Each structure stands twice: as C-alpha cells, then as structure tokens.
Amino acid sequence: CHPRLSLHRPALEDLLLGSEANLTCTLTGLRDASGVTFTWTPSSGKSAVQGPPERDLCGCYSVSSVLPGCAEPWNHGKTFTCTAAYPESKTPLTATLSKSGNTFRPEVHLLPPPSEELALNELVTLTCLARGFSPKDVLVRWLQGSQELPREKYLTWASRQEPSQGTTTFAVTSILRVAAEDWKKGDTFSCMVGHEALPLAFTQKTIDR
Amino acid sequence: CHPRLSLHRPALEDLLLGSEANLTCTLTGLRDASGVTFTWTPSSGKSAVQGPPERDLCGCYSVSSVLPGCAEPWNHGKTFTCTAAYPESKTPLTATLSKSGNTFRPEVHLLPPPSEELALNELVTLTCLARGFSPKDVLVRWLQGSQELPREKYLTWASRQEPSQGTTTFAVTSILRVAAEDWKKGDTFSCMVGHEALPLAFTQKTIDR
C-alpha cells in the first residue's frame, strides 16, 4: 500500500520525567521486502537504532528508527530531519520536525470539591484545569501532601483545542477522586501541570478546605 | 483484506434531540466486487436503506445499511441483528447489538469560576462534571439563562472510564468560557447532561454568584 514517513517528537513525559527521551522516525507503508535505511540531519553520537519490521493494516509492514539523546537539540529549537531508503522506490522519503512555535503558557486551576459532594461524606472530587496553552502536549500529576499519587489513582483527559477566535489554544482537565476524611482532616492536595512553554517546566497549585 | 461486520447503536443525540434516529450495520472489508445484502431481525416497515460502496484503508471498500425508526425497539430493550451477504464468501456475516446493561445514572456537577479567574474581570470558566455513569454515551449542553448556547461556544471532552474498583463507570467534563460581566451581573448558567440511564433523559444543574 501507500508508503509514508513521519517524525515523532520526544514524548513530553520522557523529557520532563524520563531518563533518555528518544525521538522516532517511522516509515509506514513499505508493503514489500524490507531492508530500509535512515538518515538524520543532526547525527552526533546519536547512533540511530532500527527495529523489527512490524506489520500494520492488512500488510503495510512498517519499520522504525530511534534517535537517542536528541533531548538537547530538541528544546534548543533545532530541526530534526529523517530520510528513509526502501526498495519499492527510487527516491528516499523524508520528514522534518522541530519544536513547535507560537507557544502559549498554560493557566492551571484547582477547583474545590462540589459542595453537594463533600456532604455525602465519602468520595469528594478535585478538578484540575489546564487552559489555553502552546502545543497540545501536557503533563498532569497529583500530590497528596508531598507525595505524588499513582497515575492510576486519577483520570486525565486528552488535550482538546477550545472555542477561540484567532489563536489556537488547547485545554485539559483531570479528575482526582479523594477520600473525604482527608479533605476534611486538612490533608492538602496539588495539581502539577507540565508544559513546553512553562519556564520552570511545571506549575503547581494547591488547595485545601 | 479481512472482511468484517458491525452494528452501530442509535446516536444518543439523535435519540434525545434528533428527528429520526437511525441504527447502522456496516460491512467493512469486502475487498472485492460488491453487491452485498442485509437482513435485520426486527423488520417492521423499517425498509433498510443501503448506500454507495465507500472505500477504506488501501482498498477495504465498505458498504452500509441503515434501519430507520428503531428508536422504539432500541430503548425498549430489544436486540437488533444484522447479517450481510457478499460474494467473497459462502457464509453471511452477522452482528448483534442491544441497549447496554448494568446502567449507572450520572452524577452532574457545576463548578464555580476559579476565584483567581473572576478577578481578572474578562473571561471566567464554568466546569461541568458528569461522573460515574452507565454506558459511555452522554450529552452535555449549556444554558445561558434559558437559552441553549451553540455547541460551538463551549468545549466538551470524551467519556473516559475512571479509576475504580469493581464497577466500570465513566466520566465527562465540559468547559464553558463566559463573559465575566454576565456572571457578575447575575446571569444564570446551567449544565444539562443527557444519559441513557436518567429517567427524565436529562439532568439540569444551575449556578450563579
């Protein structure tokens, strides 16, 4: 089927919370005998690693390549390029990605548990709001006092573009259900949002009765 | 490629807010010469309508069929069936759908504009929360006084399953940015949520300074 090639930016969690944030360039659609190649513009010790010829829809056997360490050039603003060389053609496909522009710092909010909820003394809800920010990419984490909770304990939606004239900005919400006794006792809670635009990568925000 | 067949329930908006809510049965994957057929279990004047052989990924030319009026049998609890008959096989594929079970009524919340927002006297935010409900399907609409606003004026995320032991329940949030002057003046606002489980199909909830 129709061969294609794309560059995947370094996952924001990997950048702000991971060890070695990679950057991928995957050649999707090489429906034929694979033996592909790759070429990166900024190649500096970053010995691109290739993988096994995975399969896609009905046969679009795809192949990837990963560039390690790119975390430095990436935030710097450099622009990574990648050209693949498969047999089903006489021309090397190419892709180019670079950190996004027109960045907009997020505006975080910590909405208190619904008055009607805190009265059924059981499970109250804290809502987090990351509104109007630069690119879609965003991290939302929660703190119980000073301890981060398991990503598994809360629910966070995906970044959605919002109704707006002129500028393209996104939003995100997170729902942390907490044990009423805690909110009542005084236990504090915080919503930490991570974003490409924030200078200090994160923005905290705490609330308590 | 691999031929398949599925039944699509009657869109919740069409049921609660539309004229004639259909129910679709689409045969995806008939990668060959089409001339398909269809068969519904409850056929009562519901003269199923077929459409043009659309195309999918690389060639999975798909064909559909629509059953009108099914809105009655559907909420009743009946179970619709559909069997397609294409040439690439000697056996008619079949699909079966029925209104979901284990229904859970939603719990709606109208969170007040963030205190820090209502002070920059410009655009404040109202947050709606539909939490722990029966099936994913849900409608969120907004009211300014007594007038519904354009779906286009607010932002509503998708229904997400939430962190929960035992029972599978979903959540949904909606963000309505409003003109501060209004909230201040006293203008009232409401979040109306529609759900298969609610007896009166909708649940209102209003709030104002």
What's B51's domain CATH number? 2.60.40.10
CA-CA-CA-CA dihedral for A73, A78, A79, A84, to nearest 10: -30
A113: Cβ contacts below 8 Å, ≥ 6 apart: A124, A125, A126, A178, A183
Neighbours of A159 (CB within 10 A): 20
* Distance (Å, whole) CA B109 – CA A120: 14
β-bridge partners, A64: A26
Shortest CA gap A162–chain B (Å): 6
Collapsed DSSP state (helix, strand, coil) of residue A50: strand
Neighbours of B23 (CB within 10 A): 25
Residue numbers of the domain that contains B137 = 101-209
Q: B201 and B195 in contact (C-beta within 8 Å)?
A: yes
- Radius of gyration (C-alpha) of chain A in whole angstroms: 22
Q: 């573009």: which residue's tokens?
A: A161
Q: A24 and A9 in contact (C-beta within 8 Å)?
A: no
Q: 């909110």: which residue's tokens?
A: A183
From B100, B129, B144, the end of a domain falls on B100
At B48, the amino acid letter reads: A
How would you class A186 by CB atoms within 10 Å of its CB: exposed for 0-12, middle for 13-18, buried for 19 or more? exposed
**A interface residues, B as partner, C-beta within 8 Å:** 1-2, 57-60, 109-112, 114, 116-117, 125, 127, 129, 131, 152-155, 157-158, 160, 162-163, 171, 173, 175, 177
Collapsed DSSP state (helix, strand, coil) of residue A16: helix
Structural domains in chain A (count): 2
Contact list in B for residue A162 (CB cut-off 8 A) is: 155, 175, 177
From B100, B121, B138, the end of a domain falls on B100
- The experimental method, as deposited, was X-ray
At B189, the amino acid letter reads: F
Contact list in A for residue B123 (CB cut-off 8 A) is: none
Structure tokens at A23: 């950057």
DSSP-derived secondary structure for A88-142: S-SS-EEEEEE--SS----EEEEEPPPTTTTTSSSEEEEEEEEEEESSS--EEEE
How would you class B25 by CB atoms within 10 Å of its CB: exposed for 0-12, middle for 13-18, buried for 19 or more? buried
Neighbours of B1 (CB within 10 A): 17
Shortest CA gap A199–chain B (Å): 21
Q: Looking at the structure, tell me whether residues B113 and B171 fall in a common domain.
A: yes
Task: Write the residue in B58, B154, B162 that is nearest to A175 by C-beta.
Answer: B162
Task: Write the residue in B57, B111, B160 that is nearest to A111 by C-beta.
Answer: B111
CA geometry: angle B24, B172, B168, nearest 5 deg: 75
From A100, A123, A155, the end of a domain falls on A100
DSSP 8-state symbol, A191: E
* Distance (Å, whole) CA B98 – CA B42: 12
Q: Looking at the structure, tell me whether residues A95 and A105 fall in a common domain.
A: no
Q: Looking at the structure, tell me whether residues B40 and B89 fall in a common domain.
A: yes
Resolution number, Å: 3.1
CA count, 13 A, side-chain hemisphere, B152: 3
Cβ distance B163 to A155 less than 8 Å, yes or no, reads yes
Q: Looking at the structure, tell me whether residues A93 and A107 fall in a common domain.
A: no
Q: B29 and B89 in contact (C-beta within 8 Å)?
A: no
Q: Looking at the structure, tell me whether residues A75 and A139 fall in a common domain.
A: no
Closest CA to B83 of B25, B1, B44: B25
Cα B44 off chain centre by: 25
Q: Looking at the structure, tell me whether residues B190 and B112 fall in a common domain.
A: yes
3-state secondary structure chain B: CCCCCEEECCCHHHHHHCCCCCCEEEECCCCCCCCCCCCECCCCCCCCEECCCCCCCCCCCCEEEECCCCHHHHHHCCEEEEEECCCCCCCCEEEEEECCCCCCCCEEEEECCCCCCCCCCCEEEEEEEEEEECCCCCEEEEEECCEECCHHHCEECCCEECCCCCCCCEEEEEEEEEEHHHHHHCCCEEEEEECCCCCCCEECCEECC
DSSP-derived secondary structure for A149-184: PPGGGSEE---EE-S-SSS--EEEEEEEEEEHHHHH
Q: Looking at the structure, tell me whether residues B182 and B114 fall in a common domain.
A: yes
Provide the number of CB pairs (under 8 Å) joining chain A to chain B. Answer: 79
CA-CA-CA-CA dihedral for B42, B44, B50, B56, to nearest 10: -20
β-bridge partners, A25: A7, A65
> In this structure, what are the phi and psi dihedrals at residue B156, rounded to the nearest 5 degrees?
-125, 125
At A148, the amino acid letter reads: E
Q: Looking at the structure, tell me whether residues A73 and A107 fall in a common domain.
A: no
* Distance (Å, whole) CA B153 – CA B125: 12
| Helix count and strand count (H, E) for chain A | 3, 16
